Design a protein around this ligand. Structure first.
Ligand SMILES: CC(C)CCC[C@@H](C)[C@H]1CC[C@H]2[C@@H]3CC=C4C[C@@H](OC(=O)CCC(=O)O)CC[C@]4(C)[C@H]3CC[C@]12C
Ligand SMILES: CC(C)CCC[C@@H](C)[C@H]1CC[C@H]2[C@@H]3CC=C4C[C@@H](OC(=O)CCC(=O)O)CC[C@]4(C)[C@H]3CC[C@]12C
Ligand SMILES: CC(C)CCC[C@@H](C)[C@H]1CC[C@H]2[C@@H]3CC=C4C[C@@H](OC(=O)CCC(=O)O)CC[C@]4(C)[C@H]3CC[C@]12C
Ligand SMILES: CC(C)CCC[C@@H](C)[C@H]1CC[C@H]2[C@@H]3CC=C4C[C@@H](OC(=O)CCC(=O)O)CC[C@]4(C)[C@H]3CC[C@]12C
Ligand SMILES: CC(C)CCC[C@@H](C)[C@H]1CC[C@H]2[C@@H]3CC=C4C[C@@H](OC(=O)CCC(=O)O)CC[C@]4(C)[C@H]3CC[C@]12C
Ligand SMILES: CC(C)CCC[C@@H](C)[C@H]1CC[C@H]2[C@@H]3CC=C4C[C@@H](OC(=O)CCC(=O)O)CC[C@]4(C)[C@H]3CC[C@]12C
Ligand SMILES: CC(C)CCC[C@@H](C)[C@H]1CC[C@H]2[C@@H]3CC=C4C[C@@H](OC(=O)CCC(=O)O)CC[C@]4(C)[C@H]3CC[C@]12C
Ligand SMILES: CC(C)CCC[C@@H](C)[C@H]1CC[C@H]2[C@@H]3CC=C4C[C@@H](OC(=O)CCC(=O)O)CC[C@]4(C)[C@H]3CC[C@]12C
Ligand SMILES: NC(=O)n1c(O)c(C(=O)c2cccs2)c2cc(Cl)ccc21
Ligand SMILES: NC(=O)n1c(O)c(C(=O)c2cccs2)c2cc(Cl)ccc21
Lengths: 690, 690
């Protein structure tokens, strides 16, 4: 049973009966020989797991996973190089250099970095913006490569500058409702942007607010020019891949290393396209012969930095958020301490080295990481084998992809959109849960469809921040009362036999009071008390001025009258003199001790007040700002001058220690109004009144 | 003394011992004859105070205040029409039509609407943007008037659309730190923009990111062309007005209706400029003769709506925020119910009627409202007399301002910048108070100086919203303990003789848990408990799998061994099989009842745990979202499967009623874990353990 027999404490009788107990530059600038061995081995993390490498139980699994992710990285390299309007050889450069740099500088053991379609589509939008903003067949796709490389270099520089300044916690402003709303709209963007390769149409590059319908108009105005031999091949590839992926999602009994339908269908499509001369019989958009070898490095152009300095921030944000959210899943499994700041440095170095050698930007993909982890990827040596496969495709076997339809690539990339399109079926899962994150989802989807991918992310983040203000805009403030003659105080409109003491009003605001809900708090407090205290103070001051005017006239003196009725000379105060009606009342010059409650002398009318104390339950108020401290001080000054005691209960110690440095406590609003709980304020009032 | 002898309640034993107690379209669509008389008399509020008009005590004071504000409105009309590059006659139209419309449609009794310099400067920027974006001496200032009228019409339409949709609470996103940071930067903008009239220079219109230094470069590159006869006159006017304003701020004894130095200095300057032929002796920039009469109305141009649709939103926001913050001061005095939604409708109608008749936009000014209220303005009839004065200046006495220097106007408008420039001396008043609103002030000032007035307001609002996330990003989570063997639980690192029970950990997070602080909450909870529970669950599952493998081999059977030492066959789990290490443990198929704490059989190693229950004090957690509910459910599922009881205390009723519709409670995380306070959870643990 709950038995308590303590005295009544009031936060100053408690702090005197139980006694309590440069700034950062001398702990962060101490050059020690034990700290450099931590800093270097956390900056260059290949010296930490490569000596501690269990060879005999990991090498074969890493080799198998490396081959099985290198084939997928080759097939996804020259398929994401079509979302950018560059030749498809520049997609193989994008999946080789970051996989080499992340081997030396990365912390995650299970992701395989390369390109992934949302970031390559954002790069494809930014390069068309840089082309359309620059001052003055093969000469068009030269400046596309030369500007995509510079967009990649600038995004890597931004990511490296994030990683050096140790701001790796920027992923927490990217809640999963915003990610789930951005991802389906990016999937719709991919599905629309890959229509011009299935139908084999010619679409000009659009870079504007809404461009998901400009591409739709430019495609659907020339449906009569659709190559049937490309559409039939893309439809045949698309329904086989979905059926075999459905079979691979089910049927997982006696089935190790599930059947790769993408590689098999690509081999079959390339063999058919070579054997029957599909470039000459029909007229298809075949992937031409790539130059065997790498390209010499280019200097990044300066005039395209100043044109796309806004899009590279969004590219860096998306490339860090995706590569953190994917890697944290495999970090919760296997229990390794993934470091957020080193990921930005590794991805920035990988993107810089990729952009110097004419690649394009990218981070890890969810499907390639799932292929690398599901087939037994133990460490990042599988990424090295996956990069060696792309190296041997670039150097030697480049002619084997020369009879590739370029519509089977767009059909394969439309294959695994079902993972990002099923999240449409969660709005109903969010409508019956919060109705604020459903709003965040809907507004993120609308802003990403309409305002593109660069501006839509910033607009959805700015709305996600406004949602938190919407949550605490109109709090459900209530009035409390006692249940069962004990220390249980709950809401008055809930239980039956609640007892409320005489002249005590316990008020509770269940939200942190800041600038958007201080006026609402004041209005709700005035409506719950029953009067405005400034109105009663002004009427009391008017009555006191009339009383002392009658005393100066020689009528009053307790307070006996001479005549029964006087004239009702309502001396109204003009401007620049009405501010004396807000002054505190002093009755030291009078012999009587008026209380403004029983009655007054002749034709003096003052509204009555039954209160003598109110209690503010501030147990849920988390913080205050200058506007709340100013408004709260203005409220308590009206409540104290009206002879009503105020108590603020339920606060802990650093709340009072923060309120000390707000110039809150003066000779009127003393520091002895803070009590511990609600019940020892009611007990203090009851032991003070009698 | 505090004596309590209640039983121990657990939010389900409490709700069964004390029994408790279309949606809005049928209360908002009820056409009643008593509701129309409220709606019309709140929409057309001149029918409410004009019959209730105490004539014999208000008429003379309203006439005096009307004359004294009409002179100031005339002198401020054709001085704010120089911040826009229009002829000065179009400033007298801006202070006449809104004062007539606000008489019929306004609620405040003490503001005098007209132009005010921040909004006219924003109009002057937007009109230059509309000129510089339009496709193709007197022909330049024709399109300035024709585009400023359309910017005014669009801003009035936006304000009227705000007032009809009843969103009049948008001023609460405009905290006083943001207003105080925006106002001084607007004052610096006014002081720089009025330099070309003192020196009498020719400056082209700049409309861009940063333009406070483009005007400074265009002025200070041609200092050698400064008219000395204008600079000397502006300096003579400027130091007299400041001295007499200092004398008027002090010396307020036997001094009614303080001496207007602006009208006297304007009369003296005009008389000197006429008597000595200042347009011919020197070569000054005198205010030319205005056409006597109004202008016929124009249709607003459509092509300039689409160019400045972004700036008109900022003009409407500033025009509502200033006219609300000024009117609320005189609404707190005199006690009248000012309505926020009617102010938007009245200002929108005033701006529309002003923009049709070739005026420009505006709301009330602080100085004109102070002049109208301080001289005895009782109602809005003083605004009507102030408009009649502007009418008689436009119609008849227009030649009296024709010898006006146009540098004395810029010198007068630099006079009362001291009210908006002294707020520089509050950063030190905000540095020792919060250091978040000092940051809001500094970032608002920097964004308004750099990004102009239109974009700077939006950027400072977007940073003000981010400040609230910065306040609750890293909360100061703590561990509590008991003081003095009673129901007082406070922070463990504060007091000396705090007692903590055996195996109980009371944890407290003093912030609402949302998406930005759920990972920090999980990391702080794991660091305060002392272990990760998923690690102990995985090691317990590995040990249990080894135990049952030894049982299948025929060695174990309580739990006696056969041999002393076995081989250390560490059967490590591959991928797609390691997720069985997170499953709950069941020991129903074993005869023994292992507890994972004392010891285990041969070479089995499990980490020990001293906990058996932890308590989460959620009294300060105001709300949750889907990310917090998901992460909290994931935390409690690890803590329950490890055989550690969890209790969540300090929550009130609608917190549990909200958590019901989150799919939070299942067969594992039952609803019986919620307790009332901290002490009756500790008492429940102590009465359950023995
Ligand atoms: C939820 C909503 C309110 C958020 C804000 C949406 C706006 C950002 C969208 C909605 C309508 C859009 C406009 C709809 C149509 C057009 C015409 C379009 O014209 C062309 O592409 C050229 C046509 C030609 O040259 O003939 C240019 C973009 C624009 C202005 C769009 C710009 C982006 C707008 C303003
Ligand atoms: C806000 C969401 C929910 C709906 C979006 C509706 C509109 C904003 C969209 C739908 C149809 C779109 C239009 C569809 C086709 C075109 C043609 C397109 O191409 C041209 O005009 C090329 C030049 C020419 O041929 O004249 C320019 C964009 C435009 C006007 C689009 C502008 C944006 C529009 C009006
Ligand atoms: C804290 C985050 C938001 C990054 C820091 C702010 C950036 C958004 C700013 C700071 C430096 C700025 C740059 C400073 C100088 C220039 C050169 C300038 O070159 C010109 O040709 C001038 C005329 C013009 O293009 O407007 C173009 C803008 C640019 C790249 C600016 C683009 C915007 C930048 C990158
Ligand atoms: C958000 C924070 C952590 C980012 C910190 C880094 C940025 C402040 C720097 C990194 C690289 C900088 C860029 C490096 C080079 C240039 C080119 C420079 O071009 C010129 O001056 C034009 C010269 C010419 O046209 O001849 C304009 C600034 C800009 C875009 C810089 C803008 C500022 C950037 C993005
Ligand atoms: C606190 C800071 C980081 C906030 C972001 C600041 C930017 C929005 C500012 C800082 C530097 C500014 C730039 C500094 C100089 C110029 C050159 C200026 O050039 C001209 O006016 C034309 C010159 C010519 O024609 O010769 C155009 C604006 C611009 C790009 C400014 C645009 C606005 C910028 C990028
Ligand atoms: C961010 C805050 C704290 C400091 C701001 C520093 C810069 C962003 C400012 C200071 C000096 C400014 C410059 C001062 C003078 C000019 C000349 C001005 O006029 C012309 O160039 C006209 C055409 C010509 O004559 O070439 C254009 C803006 C510019 C470059 C300004 C651009 C913005 C600058 C670099
Ligand atoms: C909820 C708040 C933020 C207001 C609602 C959204 C507005 C910001 C949008 C909705 C309608 C939009 C307008 C819809 C159509 C047009 C015509 C369009 O005309 C053109 O010549 C098209 C090409 C172009 O200028 O880009 C110019 C943009 C404009 C005015 C748009 C400007 C932006 C507007 C006002
Ligand atoms: C924030 C919410 C509450 C505002 C609600 C009102 C707006 C949605 C409306 C009110 C007036 C509208 C404007 C009225 C007229 C026009 C002109 C119109 O011009 C054309 O279509 C061009 C025709 C041509 O060039 O021939 C473009 C949209 C625009 C700016 C409209 C944009 C949308 C506005 C601002
Ligand atoms: N598992 C696997 O081998 N693959 C995929 O999952 C692919 C996708 O459709 C992706 C959509 C978003 C990221 S990947 C894919 C595409 C090609 Cl061209 C070759 C192989 C592929
Ligand atoms: N009280 C008064 O009569 N006046 C002022 O206060 C003036 C200002 O400087 C203002 C600065 C911001 C708003 S007003 C002012 C200017 C002129 Cl041209 C004529 C009279 C004036």
């Amino acid at each position: 049973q709950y038995i308590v027999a303590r005295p009544v404490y009031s936060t100053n009788a408690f702090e005197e009966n139980h006694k309590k107990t440069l700034d950062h530059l001398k702990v962060c600038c101490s050059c020690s020989p034990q700290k450099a061995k931590r800093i270097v081995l956390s900056l260059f993390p290949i010296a930490s797991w490569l000596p501690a490498y269990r060879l005999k139980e990991w090498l074969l699994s890493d080799i198998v996973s490396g081959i099985s992710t290198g084939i997928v990285a080759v097939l996804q390299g020259l398929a994401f190089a079509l979302l950018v309007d560059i030749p498809p050889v520049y997609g193989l450069y994008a999946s080789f250099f970051p996989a080499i740099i992340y081997l030396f500088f990365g912390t995650s053991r299970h992701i395989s970095v390369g390109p992934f379609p949302i970031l390559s589509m954002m790069v494809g939008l930014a390069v068309s913006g840089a082309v359309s903003k620059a001052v003055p067949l093969l000469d068009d796709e030269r400046v596309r490569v030369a500007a995509a490389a510079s967009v990649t270099v600038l995004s890597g520089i931004i990511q490296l500058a994030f990683g050096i300044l140790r701001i790796g916690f920027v992923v927490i402003y990217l809640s999963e409702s915003l990610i789930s709303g951005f991802t389906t709209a990016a999937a719709v963007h991919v599905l629309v942007s890959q229509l011009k390769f299935i139908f084999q149409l010619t679409v000009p590059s659009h870079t504007d607010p809404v461009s998901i319908f400009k591409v739709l108009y430019s495609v659907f105005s020339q449906i009569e020019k659709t190559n049937i031999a490309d559409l039939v091949t893309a439809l045949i590839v698309l329904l086989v891949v979905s059926i075999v992926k459905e079979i691979n999602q089910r049927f997982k009994d006696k089935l190790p290393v599930p059947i790769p339908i993408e590689f098999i269908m690509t081999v079959i499509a390339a063999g058919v396209s070579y054997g029957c001369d599909f470039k000459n019989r029909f007229k298809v958009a075949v992937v031409g012969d790539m130059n065997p070898g790498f390209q010499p490095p280019i200097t990044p152009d300066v005039e395209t930095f100043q044109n796309t300095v806004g899009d590279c921030f969004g590219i860096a944000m998306v490339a860090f958020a995706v590569a953190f959210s994917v890697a944290s899943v495999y970090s919760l499994k296997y229990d390794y301490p993934l470091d957020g700041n080193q990921e930005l440095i590794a991805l920035g170095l990988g993107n810089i080295v990729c952009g110097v050698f004419r690649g394009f930007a990218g981070s890890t993909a969810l499907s390639r990481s799932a292929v690398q982890e599901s087939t037994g990827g133990k460490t990042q040596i599988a990424g090295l084998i996956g990069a060696i496969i792309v190296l041997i495709v670039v150097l030697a076997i480049g002619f084997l992809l020369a009879p590739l339809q370029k519509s089977v690539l767009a059909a394969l990339a439309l294959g695994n959109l079902k993972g990002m399109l099923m999240q449409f079926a969660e709005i109903g899962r969010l409508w019956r849960k919060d109705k604020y994150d459903c709003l965040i989802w809907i507004m993120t989807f609308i802003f990403t469809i309409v305002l593109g991918l660069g501006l839509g992310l910033a607009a959805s983040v700015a709305f996600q921040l406004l949602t938190i203000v919407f949550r605490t805009q109109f709090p459900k403030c209530s009035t409390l009362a006692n249940i069962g003659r004990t220390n249980i105080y709950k809401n008055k409109k809930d239980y039956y036999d609640m007892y409320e003491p005489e002249g005590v009003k316990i008020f509770r605001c269940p939200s942190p009071i800041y600038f958007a809900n201080i006026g609402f708090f004041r209005r709700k407090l005035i409506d719950a008390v029953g009067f405005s205290p400034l109105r009663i103070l002004r009427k009391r001051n008017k009555a006191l001025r009339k009383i002392r005017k009658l005393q100066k006239q020689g009528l009053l003196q307790g307070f006996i009258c001479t005549v029964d009725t006087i004239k009702d000379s309502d001396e109204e105060l003009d401007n620049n003199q009405i501010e004396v009606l807000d002054q505190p009342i002093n009755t030291t010059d009078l012999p009587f001790h008026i209380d403004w409650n029983d009655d007054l002398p002749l034709n003096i009318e003052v509204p009555k007040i039954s209160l003598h104390s109110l209690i503010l339950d501030f147990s849920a108020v988390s913080f205050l700002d200058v506007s709340s401290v100013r408004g709260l001080k203005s409220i308590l000054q009206e409540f104290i001058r009206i002879k009503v005691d105020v108590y603020i209960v339920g606060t802990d110690d650093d709340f009072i220690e923060k309120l000390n440095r707000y110039e809150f406590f003066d000779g009127e609003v003393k520091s002895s109004i803070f009590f511990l709980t609600i019940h020892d304020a009611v007990l203090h009032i009851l032991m003070k009144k009698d």
